[PDB]
Structures are given as C-alpha cells and as structure tokens.
Amino acid sequence: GFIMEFAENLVLRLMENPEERDRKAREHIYEMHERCKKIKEMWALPIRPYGFWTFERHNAQLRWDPQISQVAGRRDPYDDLLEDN
C-alpha cells in the first residue's frame, strides 16, 4: 500500500486501552488510600505495648525460680528443719 494507511493503524496499535487505564487509575487510588489508612493506624502504636511484662518472654523468672528454690542458699529457714520426716 502507501505510507499513511499503515502508519495510521501502527499508531493505533502503539496507543493503549483507555478503559484499562481508567480502571487501573481508580483501582490504584482505592488501594493506595486503604494502605495509607493502614500506615496511619500503624504509626499510632506506642513504643511500649500495653501487655509488655505480661508477655511470656518478659518474665523469665516465674518459671525459673520454682526449680531453684530447693538449692542451698535460697531455702526458707523452715524447710530443712522438718524435711527430715
């Protein structure tokens, strides 16, 4: 053929779907705003959590001392006296 009859549909192939572009734009806005709200919530967390000491890793002694309160140097004076019988 001639030049323009091919350059026309060439440019038309080069250009994209606008419906896809609009859908992607509204989508991206939706999830970006949702993620923005999520990050805003995340930044509100205090440095020290409400539980803190309640956490099992932050006790480390309520389940260690009971198995140590029997060794010498930690016993209540009234433990060795009546342990004989």
Partner: peptide
C-alpha cells in the same frame, strides 16, 4: 510528518 498526521 507521518506521525502527527496519521495519529487519530
């Protein structure tokens, strides 16, 4: 020449 004119 051929792009700005063959474009819709």
């Amino acid at each position: 020449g051929v792009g700005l004119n063959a474009k819709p």
